[PDB]
Paper text:
BbvCI is composed of two protein subunits, each containing one catalytic site. Either site can be inactivated by mutation resulting in enzyme variants that nick DNA in a strand-specific manner.
Purified samples of wild-type BbvCI, containing a 1:1 ratio of R1 and R2 subunits yielded crystals under acidic conditions (pH 4.5) in the presence of an excess of duplex DNA oligo containing the target site, and 2 mM calcium chloride. However, after derivatization with heavy atom compounds ‘I3C’ or tantalum bromide, the space group was converted to C2221, with only two subunits (one dimer) in the asymmetric unit. We initially calculated MIR phases, built an initial structure, and conducted refinements using datasets corresponding to the latter (heavy-atom) space group, and then subsequently determined the final, higher resolution structure of the native (non-derivatized) protein in the original C222 space group via molecular replacement and phase extension. The resulting electron density maps clearly corresponded to two full-length protein chains, but no density corresponding to DNA was present. In contrast, modeling the electron density as a homodimer comprising two copies of the R2 subunit resulted in satisfactory values for Rwork and Rfree (0.189/0.249, respectively), excellent correlation of the model to experimental electron density, and significantly improved geometric quality. An intervening four-stranded, anti-parallel beta-sheet (residues 116–175) protrudes from this core. This interacts in a domain-swapped manner with its symmetry-mate in the opposing subunit, to form a dimer interface corresponding to an elongated beta-sheet. However, the two sites in the protein dimer are located ∼45 Å apart from one another–too far away from each other to catalyze double-strand cleavage reactions producing a 3-base overhang.
Author numbering:
A (entry chain A): 7 to 285
B (entry chain B): 7 to 282
The structure:
């Protein structure tokens, strides 16, 4: 198995909560899930209809399962539903190796690198082997690479830390309220300092944002997948929109573009006379 | 109305340095300059060919005087040479009032607002009349507005400061090296915090190649006008490329769009959503 973020939380949640285990048994969550997974992995191409099909299965599984997580559970809006989308992105980008050339080690939730700072214990350790911190940051989904960072002082053979250098990072939220969109603006800033070529998206199903006023962030795209407000979800009669396959198709197109580009290329700068060729 | 930055630095430099004054007359800098100016003001339209024409005059004037500035002048890349493009932008945007609807006060070099912090002398002045500082930053060229900022205490008239709130800010550099592109990243960050809707450009003639991946954190566009490297200028065979009128045409098009757009809209920014 590649990653399967959702599937694993299913098995972990049922391995720690026996209540939940029976709920998953009784309402056939596990069959629903396996079905979703099977449906998704067999989609081999990535033309628009291919992608639309994945979204189709996504909608189905969410329709089949989310109501159980809402009414039959207790704590399922923390790391049980936010993972359906995480795993979805795993499927969406399962077949990119063959298409972008190389074998990308990271296409799951991951801590994306931000900073390296030095916190030596004392003058001796400073000289001999300075203690350091790498600050990273949880993202719901990262396409990127794994690196080893080592610091050696006079003595040691160096403390090593494993780090993740992201090329795309995606936040995945059921609904996007202002509190969260501030976090995301905030880490976009940091993220762009650390990894200037990391594309950064926030993706939500609903937008729970009070009309307020517009925000210049360093986020490359926000996506509200169901085109709806959150005011609508807990009122008279249900009726949620499907997750819009169009948006996912777009998001896919932009990421693949990104992984296609040489990101510095001064030669093409000089050639054109612009560093930021936006057509 | 119409500011003339280069002309004035010519005028300043010569009242100051009398050696340079003689150099200016001997090599006919003054005639060259006003010719450049004359040529430029009489182009009134702003279609693509119009703009190309201005660039033509630009290239000529640069060709006519830059050599003098290099050879015959002590120190000239400080402001003398950079001011040419500054003034050029003055000509390029001289007819925007009639095109954008409003009478824009500022289209010259200017200090663009950045921050307000409070540094009161003591507890009394804190209450009574707090002392403050406005931090602004020199830009090569700004389209924007003037504003007056007043702070009033408990009892008093309030200290006023004049400030400039830019809509477009353009840096103008002959050549762009890593060291400078960091400065520009650095002030872009500040600038975007202070004035989120201010477009921010760097415009250069030559750009250094091998130097290292730079920080272009929040610069809206860089322009290398001559498409060349900055290491070909002091080699056996000169051969500098003309400033590319295509690029200037672009830059013009981007700025005019910017000034045409509604920027901030407090209560009609829901549809925006997830397009663009």
């Amino acid at each position: 198995p590649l990653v399967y973020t959702h599937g694993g939380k299913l098995e972990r949640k049922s391995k720690k909560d026996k209540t939940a285990s029976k709920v998953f048994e009784e309402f056939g969550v596990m069959e629903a899930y396996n079905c979703w997974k099977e449906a998704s992995l067999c989609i081999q191409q990535r033309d628009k209809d291919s992608v639309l099909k994945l979204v189709a299965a996504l909608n189905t599984y969410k329709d089949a399962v989310e109501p159980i997580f809402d009414s039959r559970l207790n704590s399922a809006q923390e790391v049980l539903q936010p993972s359906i989308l995480e795993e979805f992105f795993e499927y969406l980008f399962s077949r990119i190796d063959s298409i972008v050339g190389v074998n990308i080690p990271i296409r799951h939730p991951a801590k994306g690198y931000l900073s390296l700072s030095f916190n030596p214990h004392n003058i001796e350790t400073l000289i001999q082997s300075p203690e350091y911190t790498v600050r990273a940051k949880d993202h719901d989904f990262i396409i990127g690479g794994s690196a080893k960072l080592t610091i050696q002082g006079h003595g040691g053979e160096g403390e090593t830390t494993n780090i993740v250098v992201p090329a795309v990072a995606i936040e995945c939220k059921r609904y996007l309220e202002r509190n969260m969109l501030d976090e995301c603006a905030g880490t976009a800033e940091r993220l762009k300092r650390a990894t200037p070529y990391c594309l950064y998206f926030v993706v939500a199903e609903y937008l729970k944002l009070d009309d307020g006023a517009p925000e210049l962030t360093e986020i490359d795209e926000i996506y509200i997948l169901r085109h709806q407000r959150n005011s609508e979800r807990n009122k008279p009669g249900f009726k949620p929109n499907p997750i819009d396959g169009e948006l996912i198709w777009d998001l896919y197109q932009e990421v693949m573009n990104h992984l296609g580009k040489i990101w510095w290329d001064p030669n093409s700068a000089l050639q054109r006379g612009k560093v930021f060729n936006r057509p």
